[model samples]
Target: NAMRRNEDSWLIDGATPLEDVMRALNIHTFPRDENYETIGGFMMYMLRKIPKKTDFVLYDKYKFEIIDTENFRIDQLMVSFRKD
Candidate 1:
């Protein structure tokens, strides 16, 4: 039988898409890389609302003030985790 639990993390990883959370959330917004644009907003919402086992990356423009880098490589926000 199927069940929904308080545990068990479900994600639709770019490498392996169209599963668990993606299906449940009916998330067919972007291809994958464009995930930030499509679901970035939701991520921020969860970040502030849930703040439990959730996180996100910010682009150079957004990260500049946070990450002081005199000299850095190209900009790309990778996946990061946070919990409150």
Candidate 2:
């Protein structure tokens, strides 16, 4: 995964592999088994639709914010731990 650490979040390229993200975040398992491989694909699978810039999704204690999109695909995402 192309990941850049921020003060309270990680700026991640959507094309980054899901395994990379999981490893970086110390995540042991996916929420469910699916056909997705990338973080972008995972987000689409969770939302069940195309995402736009500024869209946000919550899962567990994490928040995923859509940072950019192109050609109906996610380009960048900001992932952070949520307190609530």
Candidate 3:
């Protein structure tokens, strides 16, 4: 069964291409020595500070309909759940 909640929200990440959150944050990106732990820790801080109502939705730019066709162009929507 499917359900829809008011708190539910969908997001289309990278709606503005060539720019991700990391890039937007201007975090130094070192290919050889990527600071994965640092980034994860920062995110943890944010997550802890964020309210329960906040939802981090990650949407895809591409679309995948049940029936695939050449002319089929649908925007992707990935929803995040928040129990408040």
- Highest lDDT model number: 2
lDDT of each: 0.31, 0.81, 0.30
Best by TM-score: 2
Q: In angstroms, give how far residue 33 of model 1 lies from its true place.
A: 21
TM-score of each: 0.20, 0.80, 0.23
lDDT of 3 by residue, 12-69 (tens): 3322232343454343442323332332222323344432222232223221111111
Ranked by lDDT from best down, the candidates are: 2, 1, 3
lDDT of 2 by residue, 1-84 (tens): 355456598899998988888878887867546477789888877777778877777866688889999878789999999656
Q: Comparing 1 and 2 by lDDT, which wins?
A: 2
lDDT of 1: 0.31
The CA lDDT at 65 in model 3 is 15
lDDT tens per residue, model 1, 1-84: 133234433333322222332444444552455443423333443345422222343332221011111132112222322232
Worst ten in a row by lDDT for model 1: 61-70
Candidate 3, position 54, lDDT: 25
Question: Can you list the residue pairs that collide in candidate 1?
Answer: none
